[PDB]
Amino acid sequence: GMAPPSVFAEVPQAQPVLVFKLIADFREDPDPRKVNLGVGAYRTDDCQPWVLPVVRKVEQRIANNSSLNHEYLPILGLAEFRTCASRLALGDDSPALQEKRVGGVQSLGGTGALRIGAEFLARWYNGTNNKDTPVYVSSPTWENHNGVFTTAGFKDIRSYRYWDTEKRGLDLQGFLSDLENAPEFSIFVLHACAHNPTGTDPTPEQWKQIASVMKRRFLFPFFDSAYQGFASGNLEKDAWAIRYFVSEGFELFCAQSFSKNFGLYNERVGNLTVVAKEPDSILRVLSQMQKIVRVTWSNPPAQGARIVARTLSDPELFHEWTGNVKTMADRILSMRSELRARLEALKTPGTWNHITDQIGMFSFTGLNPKQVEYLINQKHIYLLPSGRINMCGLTTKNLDYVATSIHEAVTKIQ
Template sequence: QIGSVQSLGGTGALRIGAEFLRRWYNGNNNTATPVYISTPSWENHNSVFVDAGFKDIRTYHYWDAAKRGLDLQGLLDDMEKAPEFSIFILHACAHNPTGTDPTPDQWKQIAAVMKRRFLFPFFDSAYQGFASGSLDKDAWAVRYFVSEGFELFCAQSFSKNFGLYNERVGNLTVVGKDADNVQRVLSQMEKIVRTTWSNPPSQGARIVATTLTSPQLFAEWYDNVKTMADRVLLMRSELRSRLESLGTPGTWNHITEQIGMFSFTGLNPKQVEYMIKEKHIYLMASGRINMCGLTTKNLDYVAKSIHEAVTKIQ
């Protein structure tokens, strides 16, 4: 039921999957199949599917700015309204850029609607282990969909959890109804690979394979991943604590409720501009900040700067 193709990082996995779906899913060369991407999402999702030839890129509700959390009802409503056989790009864990993931119960609701509406799940798993510190917890959504009998794709990146950005190590997992079906899909994917990068580099992939198949190396790597994830979780907790101690207007529980490398702070564009120009703290205009940039040495400065931005700039 399961097969895979090595790719050039997570982006390469997305592109091979997109190329295959455009050529063979929902009819031959069907560029009109709707592809749904969350609002907001990683900007490259849109570009990859447009470049693969899809003509109907749509968005689905995800982030509720008012409550600074998941807009589950909006998401489910969009899935209910989507044409059957539409493709939905789902973040497996540590949603980029919001850091807000559905709970297991919410994932079950999402899966139920997708199954009933015959929607195709294409997972992007870029941060496994980096979200919660648990490989199993971060893979829960994908595994649940598989257990529910879905055929799906899952693009996997080893750039972050192995620190192999420059080696471009990725994997596209194909889950089908039976071995015959999977083999037919893989044979077409191999043709697509042959005309894109032809043959992926081996060094990074061998590092990953050696680590994952050696009990000793796997244990050491897993411990390292958990250490990094725990550090980010600690920085979240400390930042929230400092903002609350300063009496910064608003609520800041969303910082610890979000997960992964990024956080939607809730700062508006003018407050972000103040942070950049006056405090030299760099974040996206959307208010997204990289939590990995926080350290025990700069936490106080960042917290006080956010406090100033919120109190001075409306």
Template sequence: MSVFSGVQAAPPIEVFQLGRDYQADPSPVKVSLGVGAYRTEEGKPWILPVVKKAETILAKQVEQEEINHEYLAVLGLESFAMGATKMLLGETSPAVQENRAFGVQSLSGTGALRVGAEFLKNHMNRDVVYYSDPTWGNHGLIFKNSGFNTINKYRYWDPETKGFNFTGMIDDLENAPEGAVIILHACAHNPTGIDPSKEQWMKIAEVVKEKKLFPFFDCAYQGFASGCLDTDAWTVRYFVEQGFELFCSQSFSKNFGLYNERAGNLTVVVKDQEPIDRMKSQLTLLVRAMYSNPPAHGARVVNLVLQDAELYAEWKGCIKTMAERIIAMRQGLRERLEKLATPGDWSHITNQIGMFSYTGLTPEMCEFLKKEKHLYLLKSGRMSMCGVNNGNLDYIAQSMHEAVTKFQ
């Protein structure tokens, strides 16, 4: 017998299994509403034109041997990390101007979360983390595998109102132990699409400061949510202005369409420069043991765009295109559901923002949609709005109407 014969099979990851089921479905009306990746009006992946331009420039630089395939530094491409940090915090951020913010290139947002979590566990003795209920499916696993022994949830989604449970979140944060790490979604909360208002964020910041909690932001959708980089970064910038030290994981998968390039950044903000060199030395050892150093191509694409005014302006236009199409699909879906007199209030579809909508559909409704209507969304009712387009909008709305009517 193999020495590995005792290894037990792990349960499938729902979103990836859903993708496999979709691919195997021969139905001509099938729709993928699970994958967290942008799709065009034609339902196809989109390589941003500005990314194509940047890659053409990089190819010429390789040909002329201006760049090569040598290893990056352990903490990554420094100009990329600094550019990403400035994009998040803003050029006029006090943390940027006082040189007390820095970045660590990571394996997308997931890698940034893992590096940050291990640093907090190993060098800050943090052992308790809170994340929203619900949250992105990987948050708990990342912190568990980083050694956190206490993993808690704070209330977020209110199934009755299909909105934000502000009172529940505040109550849970007020009862969290001092020093706990709090995962906060910077914008376009995944999976609900519901974000606190500015006034609510101010109260959240007040409680986090009072309880001496450590904010760890997850920023996967800057610019992708509202179409504006500054709007989507407001929360993180507010916390910095309030004097917080914090971590923030950044992903360029969505806003650059660089899903498989794993371009990400861990932004670190501290009160003064004094501990930065020591922090970087420990982060270097942590990364060295984890994956040695990050890949270059995606980071170079992002870096080139962030440093070039013309490409940067074009990229912001691409972001706006993606955000506006998703917003339009939200409006279209709500209008159709209301026109069909689908039971319930569907205003939450347009009150939400970003890639995902927490529809409020029950697991049995979602199973019906998958088996009978060939619509593939998570059993929690989370729908990727990127899969909705004018060609399938009527079919999706009619199918949802039938599901709700059947199982209400």
């Protein structure tokens, strides 16, 4: 008599996602002093999203060009986008480009590039269908690295020491030790610049030490490049580490996102750059990439890649874009400098040079969970339990209140 249970009756409700509740609490908050330091994207000094002027310009040119059609792109994506994207990462003068040993797979953001690369490695790297190769991610790292590599089938995800809580910076000796102890052929997921979530990057000299261990132990660099140019304003400096590994003779993957440096978050524009030792392997690698893409999204969308390709391939638009990127980078640099200056003017205990030594929009402040709780509950300043803030949540108008509130948290809580 009774209706049978749903075939979904035993499907569990997934674990709540923390930051979604944080943003929801922030929007509930009636206090006019409230500040959202938990935002995950660029914001202007007026707390608004920013569509880049060059993007608006190219969108208008696209809309006014009736010759463009909607027929499927190639599985691997729009050729001009892939070429321009890889050239942006590697440099026009890259030896790997000269030697024709680079491939590029258009992907659904940086996430999609990481996923396709992980799927490839889990099938063809360090043996056939070797799911046991260790994959190392930083401690801490971007919240979806583990899930991407686990879903691609890797059974042994490990961490390398990275953030040092006491020094508020890089634990170089721990990182180097974890590299030295990593099994040969282990994969290391490396943030190319603007480490997310800490903002702490190796200096060039530290990168050389990291590369030296990886070269000697045959460790595979899987770069994640989500903030090129965005991070510092200088596209070459932000790509220095990737290019150094190339010039040291590494084979590598580089998952590139255009979500942040073009502000094209919702058009899902990414590229997986592959650097191989010999030109003949690019065709073989890409042929396997095609099979992976085919069963995932079939072929990639056009609009965002068209915008990026048009911008990177035209000198006038490229120059405008580099200025727009510098605007974003400079605002973040300003918020870092202004926050540090205020914390020091308030004689806040501890050192605060990490606020300006860190790079990009995310910063591990060094505040502890109880201090974070104070900022949220008492001061209506919303940030993650880790102490991560987005510098773009700071503004000329809120800087005094945020600095004063941090000073209160540091002196009064714990």
